[PDB]
Symmetry: D2
Subunit: 335 residues, 4 copies
Amino acid sequence: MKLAVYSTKQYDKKYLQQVNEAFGFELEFFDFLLTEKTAKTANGCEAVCIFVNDDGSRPVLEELKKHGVKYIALRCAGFNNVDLDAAKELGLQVVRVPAYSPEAVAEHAIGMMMTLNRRIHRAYQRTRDANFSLEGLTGFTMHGKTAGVIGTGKIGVAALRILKGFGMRLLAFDPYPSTAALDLGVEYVDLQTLFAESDVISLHCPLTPENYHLLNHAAFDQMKNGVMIINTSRGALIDSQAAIEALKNQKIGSLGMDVYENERDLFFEDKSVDVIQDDVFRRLSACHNVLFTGHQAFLTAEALISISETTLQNLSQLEKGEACPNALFKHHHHH
Amino acid sequence: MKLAVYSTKQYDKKYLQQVNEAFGFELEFFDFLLTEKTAKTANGCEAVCIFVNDDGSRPVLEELKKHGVKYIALRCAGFNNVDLDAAKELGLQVVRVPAYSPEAVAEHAIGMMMTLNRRIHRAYQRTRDANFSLEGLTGFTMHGKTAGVIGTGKIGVAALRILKGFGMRLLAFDPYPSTAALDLGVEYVDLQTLFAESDVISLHCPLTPENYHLLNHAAFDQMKNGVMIINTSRGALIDSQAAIEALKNQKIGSLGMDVYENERDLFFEDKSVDVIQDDVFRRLSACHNVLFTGHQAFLTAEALISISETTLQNLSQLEKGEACPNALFK
Amino acid sequence: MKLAVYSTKQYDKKYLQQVNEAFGFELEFFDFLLTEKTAKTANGCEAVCIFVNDDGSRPVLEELKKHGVKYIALRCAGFNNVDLDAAKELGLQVVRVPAYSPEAVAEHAIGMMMTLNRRIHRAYQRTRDANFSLEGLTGFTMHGKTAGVIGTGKIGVAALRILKGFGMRLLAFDPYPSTAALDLGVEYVDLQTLFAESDVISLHCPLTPENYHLLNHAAFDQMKNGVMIINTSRGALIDSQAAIEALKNQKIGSLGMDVYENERDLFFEDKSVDVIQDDVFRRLSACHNVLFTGHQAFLTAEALISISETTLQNLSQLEKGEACPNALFK
Amino acid sequence: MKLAVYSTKQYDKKYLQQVNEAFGFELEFFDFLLTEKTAKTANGCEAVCIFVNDDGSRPVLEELKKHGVKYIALRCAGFNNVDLDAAKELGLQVVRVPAYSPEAVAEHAIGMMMTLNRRIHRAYQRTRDANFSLEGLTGFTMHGKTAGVIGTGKIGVAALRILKGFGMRLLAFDPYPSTAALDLGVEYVDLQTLFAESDVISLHCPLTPENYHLLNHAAFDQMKNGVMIINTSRGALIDSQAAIEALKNQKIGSLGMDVYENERDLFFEDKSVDVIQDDVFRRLSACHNVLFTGHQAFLTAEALISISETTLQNLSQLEKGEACPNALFKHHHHH
Ligand SMILES: NC(=O)C1=CN([C@@H]2O[C@H](COP(=O)(O)OP(=O)(O)OC[C@H]3O[C@@H](n4cnc5c(N)ncnc54)[C@H](O)[C@@H]3O)[C@@H](O)[C@H]2O)C=CC1
Ligand SMILES: NC(=O)C1=CN([C@@H]2O[C@H](COP(=O)(O)OP(=O)(O)OC[C@H]3O[C@@H](n4cnc5c(N)ncnc54)[C@H](O)[C@@H]3O)[C@@H](O)[C@H]2O)C=CC1
């Protein structure tokens, strides 16, 4: 099989290449986005591998079919960029990565928490220029504080295990509480209680209509002053305009956000005047204890390997006519 | 009692003031270093309070006695800056903070590990300027890796609990076993085995004559390529020239060092008769996955309060003629 | 003479030591502020040398007298920190430096202008990380633009020569003409015209009662969209809140400010209050093409050497008992 | 006419769109590199507009011809990326921009000099975070110092005008001395004299066999300690390895280099290594008074507009069958 990979970053290429020693596919790497115009680059490939910014809408799918492509593989969990209804009509098969390594994501959340707490990002900014001042760097001791985790799927639970290690009092909210968490000594609570008592709050849940703007002004009002908020889940979970105010009023002590590529263009203040973010990313980072990372939560060697393994295996199943458990369909509840 | 605080930073002032609400000392804050020249500023204070950079050598103490000081309180664990024998000769009394909050120090080490691992420090420099590129930011998953902790005292144990939460395999080297460490499932091993097997190495031990340059050229040779090394302990535990070389060779993946103020004129490479260089700090930080923090490991609100509480308590005990357990000699 | 130097920076020491060769004085460098409390450190010295942040108030001056000091030498132009008549009464003598090198200040204003224009400060933050992206860095060609200079004294004339070398049209506002500006082909205009026509505006004038908030909201309304504004003069020439607004609505393209230490504490956004901060320096630097320097305009080796020469000489005039032109009274 | 633009950056798009109001071409903007693989995206276009990293080798040109392309426009001065011999053989006409605005380039060189002199880039990194310390920021007064300019074409002369305004003593070297400079008050001198006497040295010359590694170890030894060196000309003008050593030894006070995209990969480390990296850019910037810009010298609105005007005008002349003075041929001397 010949595979064309779009939107390739160096890490994608390295891991896909490394993983491919097992599959022996023919790999063609493209830096650029898949679009209706670039689809013709796929001629002679059976499959394409795409990521979050790639265009999988119907006209792109039509071009891919004209050019002989049969399989579309997303090297990511998100799939909203792909028109599944069109894909079915075209007889095109679509596969994904089900979930990122839970340990990799939870660890990233924890990394963000600590970086913010000890002001390590600021410290490096000084020390790289041999400035050793500590003023404004003071953090807080984690042990004996309360951590609140929103969502107790595998990521949340992986977070909860690290948090326990810190010797934190553990609270969680999930509409469906888990046995694994309960076994860890987590206390399930209502949201309001979680808002009220938590020193650190970490979001590990999918975005559903129930939880759009889950953290709103009313939520911020409920929180402790100086609270730390970490979001490696989707942006919409937070009302960003509320979050900004909370920062100004110093309700939020610290904020860390892992910004999905598909979400950055909003994720804003925001005004219908002039000028907006990206300036907002710059301002917050400068004026507050604010940290953005660029959808980095899965960015470890082991996780990337997993993503590559799953993607190549999915493709292998498709070419072989084996039923692939990662197949997507139009009625999928998260489409 | 009037207390003159030297080398005052904004945090020192804030926490000392807050804690003193329960004590009522008369606090006089000075920004500058205590030296033989500045010691006269203390005239009219029974006590002084000092930190690692302040000069406690015999000539300074001589001036302090001249000027009526009876007590010296180090708002720190280290006392290498104070000449204890001269202090006793002069009839001065010296007290200290015995240990920092073990949790604060260990958490700092963990924070350093995570910032380095995920290149969070590099990431910030990009995103503060709305550069969202991820290339070169690749880390490693902690879970299922081996951590090697050198020293199983209170800090090392506090680190081991966190490292367990990460799901790491646990190794340690200590001349003495800790029951709390054992309870964690820590496997004590010889140092070479720890060097050979450890993905992440963290230093949590006091500097002794036995352990000067504990991490040397041979130690690095033993280590796994890509190893992460963290030092929130004293600098002289690591042979800096050998670490620099290990970085250049790519034996060391990541290095985090919490740089003692008194130790900054070390870590040198160096050259003969040129400057004093902090240029190395700049060079290493640019070239490699290296992080320096400036003796930041106890820098939390809770640890600072504790330091302050202990210092004022030490002083109150002297004033009352009580025996202070934190005295450096009788 | 033994001279004690307060508030010493490395640069003060280096240049002061250099100039001392012609003088032979004994110095005495202190990093700290001169205050009522530290004045006693001067004992043994005939003279002290102070800068802008040092305390020259009456009590400081008494303590200094008590401790045997006769002469106070400023290494700056400004003297509002010092109590003049009080010194007279004490029979204390105080010498200053008349003005800083005009070329050094003008060159700095031009440096600021170009750094802002080409976003050189932004490019460097990218390129230090080996990020070579150009997007957002676009400047404007200077040649053929209109430069507006407010104040045609020595610094302003120095700025004008440079601006002329760039091939700029030259406007100025001064209540007095300078023959040297006229010779450059400078065309004097009313302020409103200068505001209307100028691509680049640079301030080179002292603060007078009649120019406080010269650059105000009405002034900003007159200006071209995208205007670049430089102030190496005193902060109060610009109404800071108006400037912030004009930045927000994009009337001001670029703003460069050399921020006086004694002025830093104002710069009003200005919220009240929780609690006083220069979050504003941070917000402005991030959200716009804004550059702050820390009273850096006179900071060159040649300028420092000059400040050093005048100061030491100023001292010799005193010791010889001869007159000081830079003396602030008899 | 339909024009496909490769390697498009946002400033490129903005100026080309603005300029096109007068031309009325159909513009299609592509972010990615023109390659043999992406050449097919030009189908339906008479022309392409490319920049320094675009691949103009014969296989690409062959593909462009197959897809109907007639004209190739370089929006830059450099042209080594295009195989002119192949272009003639295929009947493809190639045009370029002859030179960049001389004022824009000279002004960039001066801007670098001043930022480096006053350490303005360092000041900003401190002041953006409200750090006002001046230690290490000390400069030198330009007035009364000596400037050496190497190359007296239009850029060098434009640079000399600015430098004259600083009240600098001016020296230059050019194998063919210019009237314009002589009229400025410039003293033409031999190189060793220029090296010996110059406080600031700026390069404004084309790269020739005669001047490859013009600035070498011997050049550096002749220089004044603390010399400032600015290069907005090509990289090969300086022996970088030698420049690094002079920096270590503190022969060079400050160095500014505008790094051509096509030259980025060079600038030797060395040890050739892994092989080859720009940790050296990172190090130099950190350990020394060093500044890189990424070929930013022509990056002003006025200069970009010129580039755009020239580019569209060259294309209209080609479509109209008028002789375009910017046409490139294989016997061109450069090359
Ligand atoms: N960045 C910073 O400011 C801080 C640095 N430290 C350093 O880290 C050390 C550990 O702190 P604590 O647990 O409070 O000390 P502790 O005195 O409770 O225990 C020290 C432990 O390290 C062990 N040890 C001694 N020599 C050793 C060697 N060669 N190898 C392995 N282990 C050895 C001891 O047997 C003991 O278990 C301190 O002694 C201190 O010097 C401690 C606090 C803050
Ligand atoms: N950032 C820095 O380091 C420095 C800033 N400066 C500032 O720049 C100022 C000027 O320096 P010099 O040229 O040496 O002074 P100078 O006395 O030679 O010239 C002052 C000029 O400004 C004019 N002026 C007075 N009021 C005016 C107004 N409302 N509008 C326009 N012009 C007015 C005077 O008529 C005179 O021509 C200083 O007074 C000082 O405040 C001075 C030295 C260093």
